[PDB]
Amino acid sequence: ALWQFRSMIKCAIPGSHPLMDFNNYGCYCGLGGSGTPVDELDRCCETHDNCYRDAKNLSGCYPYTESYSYSCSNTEITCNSKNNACEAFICNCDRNAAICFSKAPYNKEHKNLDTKKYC
Amino acid sequence: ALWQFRSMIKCAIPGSHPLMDFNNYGCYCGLGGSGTPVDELDRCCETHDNCYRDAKNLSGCYPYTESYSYSCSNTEITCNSKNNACEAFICNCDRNAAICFSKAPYNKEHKNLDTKKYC
Ligand SMILES: [Ca+2]
Numbered sequence: 578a579l580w581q582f583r584s585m586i587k588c589a590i591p592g593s594h595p596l597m598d599f600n601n602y603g604c605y606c607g608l609g610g611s612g613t614p615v616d617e618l619d620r621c622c623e624t625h626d627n628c629y630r631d632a633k634n635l636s637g638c639y640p641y642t643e644s645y646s647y648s649c650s651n652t653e654i655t656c657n658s659k660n661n662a663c664e665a666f667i668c669n670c671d672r673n674a675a676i677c678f679s680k681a682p683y684n685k686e687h688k689n690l691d692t693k694k695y696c
Numbered sequence: 697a698l699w700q701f702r703s704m705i706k707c708a709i710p711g712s713h714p715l716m717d718f719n720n721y722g723c724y725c726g727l728g729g730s731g732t733p734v735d736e737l738d739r740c741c742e743t744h745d746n747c748y749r750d751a752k753n754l755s756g757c758y759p760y761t762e763s764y765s766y767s768c769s770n771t772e773i774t775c776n777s778k779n780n781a782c783e784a785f786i787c788n789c790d791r792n793a794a795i796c797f798s799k800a801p802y803n804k805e806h807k808n809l810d811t812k813k814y815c
């Protein structure tokens with residue numbers, strides 16, 4: 578579920594405030610994504626967004642509202658070996674994004690980019 | 697998921713060994729169960745059994761496979777408010793059943809009960 582996505586990023590990047598930070602960032606961060614990805618970060622958003630899309634190729638698999646199982650082993654993230662297919666697919670999309678976010682630099686210049694102009 | 701029910705049980709009844717305590721007791725603790733419940737504990741199980749059957753009334757809600765979110769606050773169990781509807785249902789079934797098995801007396805002469813004669 579989305580709410581677990583955020584907690585998952587806080588798990589990798591502690592000094593971050595997910596809701597604030599990665600919302601309305603570039604062309605892909607935030608709901609939507611159109612045009613080209615302005616940066617490293619934005620790429621991560623892009624790929625994660627396609628992961629959600631792929632995830633719907635699973636029956637009754639709704640990525641936003643599906644809760645799964647994962648633990649945060651101190652900066653380290655782990656998906657429960659027990660999630661069901663949908664769940665495990667969605668946790669992975671999330672796990673991969675999070676790690677990606679932790680390695681991409683953040684450009685204040687992209688927060689609130691002008692989609693409606695720039696994307 | 698069933699694994700989380702076991703975990704729930706360990707929270708509410710510390711010291712417990714769910715796979716062996718609550719399994720195969722009465723006419724409803726474990727497997728499937730039918731007939732007349734032999735006592736309070738067994739009665740908890742029948743309520744669980746009934747709860748789960750009502751789970752399936754929600755499209756794509758398989759209680760054994762569906763992982764929900766909850767936490768165990770020092771003996772206390774809390775079902776995440778963000779759980780989707782199905783998850784929420786299943787969370788409650790397990791929660792009511794764990795409280796129930798806590799307030800219930802354990803009758804050892806009802807363990808591995810010949811369900812084909814006493815049920
Ligand atoms: Ca997006």
Ligand SMILES: [Ca+2]
Pocket residue numbers: 643644645664762763764783
């Ligand atoms: Ca779930």
Ligand SMILES: [Ca+2]
Pocket residue numbers: 724725726727728729741745
């Ligand atoms: Ca049963």
